[PDB]
Symmetry: C3
Subunit: 452 residues, 3 copies
């Protein structure tokens, strides 16, 4: 059997945040969600998330995530901030006393930890018949991490916390990832022998290593060369360095699968985003949420799309949009705002300084300049003049030509093939094939300027 | 004599692209074009580009490039994907049998290879009286490249392909750039001795090295320290890493020549772009095509310009434009769209939420807010009110003041010094110095709001 | 006693600029200003800035800076470009002959030099009882810097200029930072023994080291590990590398204090900018000048703000603004332009394609689409229809609803709770609770399209 505990109990005081550390997000999931998704793929028999401060704020999101992953996720509360050693103990109490499996310990602030790393850890753990196996790695800057101590003979002695290391030890660049596999009897038995005489006056989980080494138990360290996989987040400088490392990888994966990305460093792609072959993404682009881009698209510089669906061969340039759909071969931008519920048919055009909200717009229809469309349904191959406003429901037919400077005052229906004169205010329905007008006739006042 | 072959025959399957590898672009030229420009500057007597898959799609662009560089470029077809060794052979068939020159082999996926490197290679080749000279370099990640094998005595033994190296050899970090100079008799004679018993069942050009070493011929390797100069492109992650390296260099060259670039990493400058002394470029700027910027300009953040000409001391801020000209001391932006054929005279202004298309706009005239100008010619020192539309030809005189919310319905002529009232629709000509109006008079309905 | 000289006398010819090197800016101060601020914090008894070329252009800004820092800053002119050795001499002439203090020499092209480094230098200088102490550092590329020469015994021999080093010496990677502390009698006495037989035919300050070593005086070098602290600026590639290093640090300091910064590399924050806890900054953001952001704000991608004040919990997305204030919980963007003098009350909204200039806008009022507001005061909880223009003073009351396509022709007053019909031109005052209209009635011309 195997059980995974997720240590999400700490305060994250160095985040300086009213929002709990473990719910800050990157690439579209919270850290906690990234950690849980990864574990879920490995499918251990039990899964326990230990919470402490802010638990009423984190618990409901653990339950939300248990439904999305379709499995039970238990929650063990930690009453006293008595250390991580104490947190494992709290977590074990959600396990039956008779429990015979392996226990794997993990935190929830390690968002790039993946299912293979855990697998390699369990496999290695079982292969060497070890009481405790710990993931290590080595870093340029090892600040804030337990250091790994070994004999002459390379044997793992102990783990010394940052607050507790001599200056001489603070130099050690092998670090404790804080990801372990334990034999359960050995874990139970060393947790009892933890004392809190140390710099933080806590029960260090990391003391368990020296303890089992004392009983002449087998202690294994498994070095992870790709340090990003087990990097943790304590503050916002680390949050962003890893949001950025994860972004590099998402982008590179899209590039190898056929997407041209002009500039990876300023192209942000959330984990659920799909993009078709031979589309080009220009720089300053964020593809967020469940956004889908077809193939042979152009996604223009300085574009932001959240939960937008874009068909094949469409261009979406300098566009700020969400919760909207854009058809094949359609043209959006530059300087275009899509609010929730915009659907633009195939071959359609929303141009410069156009805003659409909750509007359905038919195949091949063009709204190219300076106009607001909201709460409107517009038919096919229609053309909406510059400088207009759908004054919010309105329905507009197919093959319509509305003139510049038309205000459609909802609710109003414009019939197939109708026209509107420049500067018309439409307050009553327009029959198919009629010209609606309201502008007064021009009058020239000669020599007005000499006089005034 | 000297002949250059360009090996552009392969499939680029790892690009995952319906567009042939060698025609993907960076900084304004396709890879093929970058390679050919560089060779062209060296001016060898013959120049042969070997094509294979997609040759009907690549051939016409080779001919297009031969005219631009004003020299003959021959095309040798490779009938069977039988290897690069085979590709050199196909390429040699476009040479006369009596041919006595040096042959230099190059690919066309090496876009930063420059005329000096080739020169250094030919010079070195002749200096050491060598049968074969190959360019090498050393890399952090040597994946996918032939490895260079040497004796104890540092003598070049052979080149081993990635697919063919032992794990022990895959560690070697000296790589084959795939750029060579051959003595022709030696090249002909080792091409005949190539066999295809290897991992790809192809005729490896790289086997030619071991072969000439066998006949006790002179084999020279010339190490290139600047690895970017001979880096090749197999996939889109490599395309962008080098588009980015080339961009660093273009930008740095502009910085040393007097252009302030706030942020090189997000400033994209195509190779043909010229920029004057003491202009400042702010971040998120792309200067593409034959775009020219004068001096003491400000080019604002988040600006995209393609084949735009900008005079001296003009500002072009948050502007998306192409195929357009902007005069000295003019002001464009923020949030401004220039379509093809926009000319804005000196001291002119196109402001926020303005779109211009095919329009000529005179010295010192201002279009500052919320307006569409297309197919129009506007004179000098005129002022176009906010929220207007040139409803496309229209001509507007000099010293005009058109009021807000005016629709000029083409075709219409507005005389010098004329005015337009706020919300006028202009359908007939306006005499110089006349006030054109059409808006109805205001009426106040008192206490309407209590009633409704 | 202690006196600081700032060597700002050189020509900066490699800047290629009509603007003096030392006045090019980064993060909101000129280099000179950064250097002077840092020294000012240390508060030496005397402070002398030596000027040479362009001194009439730099002097008035030295005086401006003396008032801001509230202390006397003297200016010593250098008549002849006779070297840096000569420049120290010119600088000493502003000191009394009897002067007994330490002299510290600094340039003004070293913008990240900080008050601690100077302090460490003075302290070290006094601690070792040294005649001359020089700051050194070591670099990947030491080009253009004096090299540090030492015996077998690690004792500082001399400093050799770039123009003067053997190729063998050009390899030395310990460099002279050009920041020193001198015992004054020793400085006076070695300046007299400087001769100009060297590559630039100048009086090298750096020769002073070999000279004092000759008199068997104590020569100390103090190595600075953080090389950015003493990096100098000769050209625009170096200007931007350090503008970028300083930006990393400003941003990281905000991140550790509680600001989420999605992308540091494209987030530019000037030194005076303050940002509250738990605000998020998205990429492509510049926060320039005395800009202040409250807490829990969202500052949207692609935003530029200069001397903007933003309250708490407001969003400012895709906005280009300056000299303006935005209240708590207000919404600005996307695609919004704020000119000088915009004040938007708490809970207010300026939306897509809106431009405001010199306008005051009351609590909870919304200007959401396609409109120009300038020279206007608008009351509370009002709503301004899309596609409108304040045709500039206008006053608008509270709880107003103005319809789409309204032109307010200043000067005009709109009473509390008044309405305006769609497409109204307002030329006369509107009583509280009145409906102002001017649009003509709609007319449908049936079958117009068949006929035309
Ligand atoms: C359990 C413990 O006492 N210390 C751990 C632990 O420190 P924290 O301050 O709790 O983050 O996490 C580190 C791994 O992220 C690890 O290096 C260290 O050994
Ligand atoms: C009449 C109109 O064109 N737009 C209205 C309309 O825009 P929405 O996109 O529907 O939010 O409703 C808003 C009322 O919440 C109002 O601020 C705005 O003026
Ligand atoms: C001709 C050949 O057989 N192999 C060459 C060749 O491999 P390709 O898979 O054909 O790209 O190009 C490399 C240089 O880009 C070089 O390293 C290698 O030795
Ligand atoms: C009348 C007008 O102002 N603009 C027209 C006009 O803009 P262009 O910039 O010329 O493409 O022609 C288009 C017809 O292809 C049409 O979509 C748009 O409505
Ligand atoms: C005073 C002198 O003769 N040379 C100095 C000096 O060279 P400049 O060319 O004047 O920048 O500044 C360098 C420090 O930025 C230092 O390395 C060098 O030793
Ligand atoms: C009438 C109007 O709406 N806007 C005017 C008005 O804008 P300002 O934001 O005030 O610069 O004054 C300008 C005169 O300098 C003029 O170019 C523009 O047309
Ligand atoms: Co109107
Ligand atoms: Mg941690
Ligand atoms: Mg290749
Ligand atoms: Mg209008
Ligand atoms: Mg210098």
């Amino acid at each position: 059997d195997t059980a995974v505990l997720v240590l999400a109990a700490g305060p994250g005081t160095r985040m300086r945040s009213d929002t709990p550390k473990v719910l800050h997000t990157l690439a579209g999931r919270s850290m906690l969600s990234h950690v849980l998704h990864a574990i879920a793929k490995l499918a251990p028999q039990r899964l326990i998330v230990v919470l402490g401060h802010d638990h009423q704020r984190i618990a409901p999101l653990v339950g939300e995530l248990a439904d999305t992953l379709g499995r039970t996720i238990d929650v063990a509360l930690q009453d006293r901030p008595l250390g991580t050693g104490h947190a494992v103990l709290c977590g074990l109490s959600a396990l039956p006393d008779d429990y015979a499996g392996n226990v794997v310990v993990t935190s929830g602030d390690t968002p790039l930890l993946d299912a293979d790393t855990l697998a390699d850890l369990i496999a290695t753990h079982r292969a060497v018949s070890a009481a405790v196996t710990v993931l290590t790695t080595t870093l340029d800057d090892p600040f804030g991490y337990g250091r790994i101590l070994r004999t002459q003979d390379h044997e793992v002695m102990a783990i010394v916390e940052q607050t507790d290391a001599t200056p001489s030890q603070r130099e050690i660049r092998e670090v404790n990832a804080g990801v372990y596999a334990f034999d359960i009897a050995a874990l139970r038995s060393a947790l009892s022998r933890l004392s809190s005489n140390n710099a933080q006056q806590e029960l260090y989980l990391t003391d368990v290593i020296a303890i089992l080494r004392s009983d002449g138990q087998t202690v294994h360290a498994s070095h992870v060369d790709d340090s990003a996989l087990v990097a943790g987040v304590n503050n916002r400088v680390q949050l962003a360095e890893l949001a950025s490392e994860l972004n590099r990888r998402v982008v590179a994966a899209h590039q190898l699968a056929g997407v041209t990305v002009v500039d990876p460093a300023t192209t942000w792609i959330d984990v659920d985003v799909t993009i078709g072959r031979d589309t080009v993404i220009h720089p300053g682009t964020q593809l967020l949420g469940r956004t889908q881009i077809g193939g042979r698209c152009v996604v223009g510089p300085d574009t932001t799309l959240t939960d937008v669906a874009v068909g094949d061969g469409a261009s979406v340039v300098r566009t700020h949009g969400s919760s909207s759909s854009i058809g094949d071969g359609a043209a959006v931008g530059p300087f275009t705002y899509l609010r929730p519920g915009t659907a633009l048919g195939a071959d359609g055009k929303l141009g410069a300084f156009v805003e659409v909200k909750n509007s359905t717009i038919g195949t091949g229809t063009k709204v190219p300049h300076l106009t607001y469309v909201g709460d409107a349904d517009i038919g096919e191959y229609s053309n909406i003049g510059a400088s207009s406003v759908f004054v919010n429901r309105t329905t507009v037919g197919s093959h319509v030509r509305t003139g510049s400077d038309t205000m459609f005052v909802a609710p109003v229906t414009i019939g197939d093939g109708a026209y509107t004169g420049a500067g018309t205010v439409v307050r009553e329905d327009v029959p198919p094939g009629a010209l609606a007008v309201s502008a007064g006739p021009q009058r020239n006042i000669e020599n007005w300027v000499q006089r005034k």
